[PDB]
Enzyme design. Structure first.
Site, PDB file in Angstrom:
ATOM      1  N   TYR A  55     -11.954  10.363   0.783  1.00  0.00           N
ATOM      2  CA  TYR A  55     -11.639  10.107  -0.640  1.00  0.00           C
ATOM      3  C   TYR A  55     -12.711  10.695  -1.564  1.00  0.00           C
ATOM      4  O   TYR A  55     -13.889  10.289  -1.444  1.00  0.00           O
ATOM      5  CB  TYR A  55     -11.672   8.608  -0.901  1.00  0.00           C
ATOM      6  CG  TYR A  55     -10.529   7.809  -0.341  1.00  0.00           C
ATOM      7  CD1 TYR A  55     -10.598   7.251   0.923  1.00  0.00           C
ATOM      8  CD2 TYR A  55      -9.406   7.554  -1.113  1.00  0.00           C
ATOM      9  CE1 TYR A  55      -9.569   6.471   1.417  1.00  0.00           C
ATOM     10  CE2 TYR A  55      -8.373   6.763  -0.636  1.00  0.00           C
ATOM     11  CZ  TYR A  55      -8.457   6.223   0.633  1.00  0.00           C
ATOM     12  OH  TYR A  55      -7.446   5.440   1.104  1.00  0.00           O
TER      13      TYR A  55
ATOM     14  N   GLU B 295     -10.725   9.669   7.589  1.00  0.00           N
ATOM     15  CA  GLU B 295      -9.992   9.574   6.306  1.00  0.00           C
ATOM     16  C   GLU B 295     -11.031   9.709   5.189  1.00  0.00           C
ATOM     17  O   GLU B 295     -12.079   9.029   5.266  1.00  0.00           O
ATOM     18  CB  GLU B 295      -9.234   8.255   6.224  1.00  0.00           C
ATOM     19  CG  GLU B 295      -8.525   8.037   4.910  1.00  0.00           C
ATOM     20  CD  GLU B 295      -7.856   6.682   4.856  1.00  0.00           C
ATOM     21  OE1 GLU B 295      -6.672   6.613   4.440  1.00  0.00           O
ATOM     22  OE2 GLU B 295      -8.522   5.697   5.247  1.00  0.00           O
TER      23      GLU B 295
ATOM     24  N   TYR C 133      -7.735  13.371  -1.422  1.00  0.00           N
ATOM     25  CA  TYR C 133      -7.561  12.482  -0.260  1.00  0.00           C
ATOM     26  C   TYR C 133      -7.154  13.357   0.924  1.00  0.00           C
ATOM     27  O   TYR C 133      -6.373  14.307   0.727  1.00  0.00           O
ATOM     28  CB  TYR C 133      -6.512  11.410  -0.592  1.00  0.00           C
ATOM     29  CG  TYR C 133      -6.115  10.569   0.586  1.00  0.00           C
ATOM     30  CD1 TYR C 133      -6.943   9.548   1.024  1.00  0.00           C
ATOM     31  CD2 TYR C 133      -4.949  10.814   1.291  1.00  0.00           C
ATOM     32  CE1 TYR C 133      -6.628   8.784   2.135  1.00  0.00           C
ATOM     33  CE2 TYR C 133      -4.626  10.063   2.418  1.00  0.00           C
ATOM     34  CZ  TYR C 133      -5.476   9.055   2.836  1.00  0.00           C
ATOM     35  OH  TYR C 133      -5.190   8.289   3.914  1.00  0.00           O
TER      36      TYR C 133
ATOM     37  N   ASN D 289       0.890  -1.193   0.000  1.00  0.00           N
ATOM     38  CA  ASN D 289       0.000   0.000   0.000  1.00  0.00           C
ATOM     39  C   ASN D 289       0.921   1.235   0.000  1.00  0.00           C
ATOM     40  O   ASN D 289       1.961   1.198   0.693  1.00  0.00           O
ATOM     41  CB  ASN D 289      -1.030  -0.078   1.136  1.00  0.00           C
ATOM     42  CG  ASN D 289      -2.233   0.843   0.961  1.00  0.00           C
ATOM     43  OD1 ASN D 289      -2.698   1.124  -0.155  1.00  0.00           O
ATOM     44  ND2 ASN D 289      -2.781   1.305   2.077  1.00  0.00           N
TER      45      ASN D 289
ATOM     46  N   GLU E  70      -2.861   6.558  -5.040  1.00  0.00           N
ATOM     47  CA  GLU E  70      -2.751   5.385  -4.133  1.00  0.00           C
ATOM     48  C   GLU E  70      -2.618   4.099  -4.967  1.00  0.00           C
ATOM     49  O   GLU E  70      -3.176   4.030  -6.080  1.00  0.00           O
ATOM     50  CB  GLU E  70      -3.946   5.320  -3.173  1.00  0.00           C
ATOM     51  CG  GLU E  70      -3.897   4.129  -2.232  1.00  0.00           C
ATOM     52  CD  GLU E  70      -4.883   4.152  -1.068  1.00  0.00           C
ATOM     53  OE1 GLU E  70      -4.907   3.160  -0.289  1.00  0.00           O
ATOM     54  OE2 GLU E  70      -5.625   5.153  -0.934  1.00  0.00           O
TER      55      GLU E  70
END
Length: 193
Positions: free
Chosen positions: A91, A89, A80, A48, A180
């Site tokens: 997105y 978090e 992000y 990741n 990502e």
């Protein structure tokens, strides 16, 4: 910064922009700052990783971003970032490759903005990495139904739609236009205007 290759996690400022490069160290991931709001990343059989430029703290600014996103396998291109208190978090997914990241998440509506339709989801990460350590937090998702690489993201429209659905936003930490990847190779070259 400008032009220096980096292969392990760091945050800093480059050419007036905040930049965050994070990798769990799987395979090879190489990040470069370019001029202004530009960054490059190249990866090969990655774990990741998250990479991109933006602001710390993020606000509700209308972002324009451009360039090129060539993944082979699982990768997203997103606005992000993170809030604190609560820990969130978030997105705004402009495009994903081989894996819809909202799979196993629960759809709370749609928001029309920037000539797009975005589907809204929340999940809970339990005992996962965070900007403040191993934690349990909500992720929020706006996922463009029609994928693209380049345009305007009116983040205010995504935050309002999340808040509309009953999704708490805390104090804004960083917000970046992030490449990502997971268990993939690729390259991307992205400019935050």
């Amino acid at each position: 910064g400008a032009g220096m290759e980096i292969t392990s996690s760091e945050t800093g400022t480059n050419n007036g922009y905040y930049y965050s490069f994070w990798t769990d160290g799987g395979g090879q991931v190489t990040y470069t700052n370019g001029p202004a709001g530009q960054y490059s990343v190249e990866w090969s059989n990655s774990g990741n990783f998250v990479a991109g430029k933006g602001w710390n703290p993020g606000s509700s600014q209308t972002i324009t971003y451009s360039g090129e996103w060539n993944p082979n396998g699982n990768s997203y291109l997103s606005v992000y970032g993170w809030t604190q208190n609560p820990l969130v978090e978030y997105y705004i997914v402009e495009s994903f490759s081989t894996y819809d990241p909202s799979t196993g998440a629960q759809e709370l509506g749609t928001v029309e903005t920037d000539d797009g339709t975005y589907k809204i989801y929340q999940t809970t990460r339990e005992n996962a990495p965070s900007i403040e350590g191993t934690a349990t937090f909500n992720q929020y998702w706006s996922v463009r139904t029609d994928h693209r690489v380049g345009g305007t993201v009116t983040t205010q429209n995504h935050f309002d739609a999340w808040k509309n659905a009953g999704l708490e936003m805390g104090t804004h930490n960083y917000m970046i236009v992030a490449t990502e990847g997971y268990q993939s190779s690729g390259s991307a070259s992205i400019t935050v205007q």
